[PDB]
Design a protein around this nucleic acid. Structure first.
Lengths: 84, 95, 105, 99, 78, 97, 84, 105, 95
DNA sequence: GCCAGCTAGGATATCACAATCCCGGTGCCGAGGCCGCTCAATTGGTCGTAGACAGCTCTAGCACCGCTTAAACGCACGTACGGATTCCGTACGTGCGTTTAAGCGGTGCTAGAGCTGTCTACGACCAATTGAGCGGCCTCGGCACCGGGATTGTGATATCCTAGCTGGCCAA
DNA sequence: TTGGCCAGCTAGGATATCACAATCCCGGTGCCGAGGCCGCTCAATTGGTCGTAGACAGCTCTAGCACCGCTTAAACGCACGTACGGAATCCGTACGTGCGTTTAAGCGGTGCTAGAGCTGTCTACGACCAATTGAGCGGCCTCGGCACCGGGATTGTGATATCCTAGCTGGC
């Protein structure tokens, strides 16, 4: 019994992207934005986890530690602080 | 339990005395400071190491260090920081 | 005695020194180099901590809140312009509003 | 007559509301399950540290916002108060994001 | 379709706006009025038609801006 | 007499300069520039010939790369001229001051 | 030797023409070029500084091209074709 | 005999190996690592050279012109998307025209 | 004159035979190729070296190398190149 | 057919309020503070080795001169694109009102990550040899520049076609 | 007589016409960068040592995962509505396009220097080995700032009422 999930990219809801953009100082937004943003987000994720998982398996690990993630981020010049 | 996370925490926390003897801290912020200093460290290290290899030295010394610092740090940081290092090294050699 | 005392400093010069030896950067390490780097780190911690507290008592807390580091790095060019690809956990964003966003008058 | 705010009022209002606060914005569960699918393709049956997904969300939110304000500049240069996709891929391409 | 001034006075009759009808409103009502207008000359033909309806006196001006007689709102003379 | 329409020429040299790879500025002014801007950091400097070659090449590359970005910005702006505002906008987006 | 001045106009008006052309822009406003003279003038500052620091580190006072390429590559501006 | 022959390869595996020892990267170097890296470099040279020549006989020269390297790296995502901050001496720019720049019809 | 620029020139030039036995070269392009390969080299080196330090090894070996390569190289490069290295290592161990 | 009151709108001064800020108290927990272990620090003697100094030459950086044309500079000029205006249409905010599913707290399962101990496959060290790779010289075959014709593509024009204009013809 | 029907003018727009020069494609040449060749050599190539870093086997427990019941509250759907974006128009100018005059930088060519890389020499200092100890880390206890909650002050927003004043319809 292994959990295989499907099409949760919609899981980011309308108010979710709303509130995020609201952080970005935008008041007025098109309805045509959401779909590409979730696509946008998607690609960025497929960028990161990609090396991250390779990082993890590089250690013969099959649990990802945060360190894998942070090194990943580091590699694209996306330095994150606080976790390692 | 038999492991050691050998941070810099006591050091930076002791720092925040002499400037602000009254202020507290969050643990998250504390971790950010640790990650910070380890960063600035290994970037300085990478700079200097690249430098000496250019200069076909085998030795890392304070002189190439001071250049590398004067390299990465922008602006008036580059001046005060080098001054502090100069005086610190100065008093150290004084035994 | 400790060189740090003999340097009057807060970071462990010999500790950074072993960092250099197991930093795998050069086969040979001059002594004063570690002192010099330690002093650098002294200073760097100095601005960051002091100005975080600077912000800190501004909304009048007694203890440092990563909000305050985030803001602290935001207001200074010499820091942020040093810290572009730097993203801070629970940092948030500086308060910025664009002018034309405002009501006309 | 029920009271009404004219449009953009609430806009600017919680522009302040969110531009001061600091918490996480996306619901964590949908996020993490999204992560689980997107990871599944590259390797099956992958175990995630609690801190790892939180780091992911932090960085992702930072990226998204950082793109948003730039899209805001793009739109304002268009003498427009609205964002449209064309702004988005404009900023994306200028940053140099080949996709 | 008849010549332009006829449509102009027609849409004047059909538009009971207190300030008459803007050259914008004039032109859009003309284009929404007839299909065979040959869209490649409606702006010039209508502008000249407005000039002639003003000089003749057919057109009267509730509100406009000086030196923009071709940019304003008109009414029929009665 | 014979006369060309505006921009047709412009397009011609667009193609012309997008074909070849030579150096688009005139040297002596450029090395002059290098010299004084060096003066401010140390007195009586000296350069190799190839050093200024790298200087010009990087310089022209940077300028053309930012120019095309400005062009794209204008294209966004329903626009065919480049204006300073476009310059600062692109510069801000790439994030340098 | 002599102190020289104000060759910034030495990037001549038509030179920014050529640059525009390779950039594939069609027509130009006048106010660009001094602004252009602005941006160019800053950029060299950021690099030559580094370069000279490189030079003087090796106790040099003649600038090698290698100095330049190191300075550039640190700025994420990798250039090829000059030495190593 | 040469390992390169024993590897059937073109780059000097022992030479890269000494590069590693005076590369100051690790205190310890596994043997096959150098071979592996050499093979990588083999391949990388393979695409770059072949496709530069690919362009080369296209405007029908007999010898490689840095024009052609520049173009060669331009047309492939997998290369340029590997080579962003890469600027090429006398490279020039790929032929790109924007559509709206064209005359209307 | 008593110095040696110990490039890779003969190597890459010998390469351009087996694919294009007929084509020539410019010296500038040749230099660009040299600079290129030395680049891709030391970036791979930096990657792997960082890796093993994470992994608290002291040894650099083909396995961490192959990960690092599979790291930097994007796309189908990552597959063909690793395949070539596998086969190359394979025949080498065959003596 | 001409003047006053009606009336509408528009600008300005005024009120209400509900969303936000500020306060005092509560409790809560994360930050701080003390105690016990030790290993990762200092400390001392050594060698040898990278590095400081010192001198040379000769290579490249540099000043300088004459010449040229090619590129730059200043000027008319107009047209084509920018910028200001309006406006109409609606895709948007925004404010109900419901529902779920996200959070949350808890439990039970486990496995997989990690620490311990073992052996050993292999990698640096080192001396000795060579042939492979550096560089220096020459030759030559590809190519940059020169000059001339051909094609496309562009800019202007004359014509064709058309719709509207204006006057002539006919019935009311 | 005169307004409607008609018919030919009329002007303009669309359209095909023709004219030129820009580039392209072709040759032709000397020019030079690539290449072949030879000579010198130093890192590569072998073999043996010896050590040790990693590989494996063997545990344990922690953290991750999965299941389960509340508890909303955030989301969704929906009604309503307006202010923004597209669009379209119109006017002003400024920059491309050409011309005519200037000049200054490439170039090439030469004399000139100092400073860079080379050799050779002396040495201080840091890697190394072993001994010693206390500062650092974790573990435990604690308590004082804070987040929450709740309970008043403020105000920016939206509504409102006043006023004025300008264009229409009733009266004299």
């Amino acid at each position: 019994h292994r959990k295989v999930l499907r099409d949760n990219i919609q899981g980011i809801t309308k108010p979710a992207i709303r509130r995020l953009a609201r952080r970005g100082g935008v008041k007025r937004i098109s309805g045509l934005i959401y779909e590409e943003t979730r696509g946008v987000l998607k690609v960025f994720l497929e960028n990161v986890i990609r090396d991250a998982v390779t990082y993890t398996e590089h250690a013969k690990r099959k649990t990802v530690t945060a360190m894998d993630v942070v090194y990943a981020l580091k590699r694209q010049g996306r330095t994150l602080y606080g976790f390692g | 339990r038999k492991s050691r996370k050998e941070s810099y925490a006591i050091y930076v926390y002791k720092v925040l005395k002499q400037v602000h003897p009254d202020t507290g801290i969050s643990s998250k912020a504390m971790s950010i400071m640790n990650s910070f200093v380890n960063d600035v460290f290994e970037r300085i290290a990478g700079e200097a190491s690249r430098l000496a290899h250019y200069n076909k030295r085998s030795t890392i010394t304070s002189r190439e260090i001071q250049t590398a610092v004067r390299l990465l740090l922008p602006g008036e940081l580059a001046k005060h920081a080098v001054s502090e290092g100069t005086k610190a090294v100065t008093k150290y050699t004084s035994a | 005695a400790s060189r740090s005392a003999k340097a009057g400093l807060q970071f462990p010069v010999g500790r950074i020194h072993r960092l250099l030896r197991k930093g795998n950067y050069a086969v040979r390490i001059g002594s004063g180099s570690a002192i010099y780097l330690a002093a650098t780190l002294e200073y760097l911690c100095a601005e960051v901590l002091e100005l975080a507290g600077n912000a800190a008592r501004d909304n009048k807390k007694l203890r440092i809140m990563p909000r305050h580091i985030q803001l602290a790095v935001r207001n200074d060019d010499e820091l942020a312009k040093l810290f572009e690809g730097v993203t801070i956990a629970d940092g948030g964003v500086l308060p910025n509003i664009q002018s034309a966003l405002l009501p006309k008058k | 007559k029920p009271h009404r705010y004219r449009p953009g009022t609430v806009a600017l209002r919680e522009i302040r509301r969110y531009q001061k606060s600091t918490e996480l914005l996306i619901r964590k569960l949908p996020f993490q399950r999204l992560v689980r699918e997107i990871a599944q393709d590259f390797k099956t049956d992958l175990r995630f540290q609690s801190s790892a997904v939180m780091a992911l969300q932090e960085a992702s939110e930072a990226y998204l916002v950082g793109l948003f304000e730039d899209t805001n500049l793009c739109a304002i240069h268009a003498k427009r108060v609205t964002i449209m996709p064309k702004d988005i891929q404009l900023a994306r391409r200028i940053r140099g994001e080949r996709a | 379709h008849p010549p332009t001034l006829s449509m102009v006075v027609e849409v004047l009759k059909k538009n009971t706006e207190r300030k008459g009808t803007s050259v914008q409103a004039i032109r859009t009502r003309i284009l929404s009025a007839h299909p065979t207008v040959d869209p490649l000359r409606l702006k010039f033909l209508l502008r000249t038609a407005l000039n002639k309806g003003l000089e003749k006196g057919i057109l009267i001006r509730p509100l406009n801006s000086s030196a923009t007689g071709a940019t304003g709102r008109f009414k029929l003379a009665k």
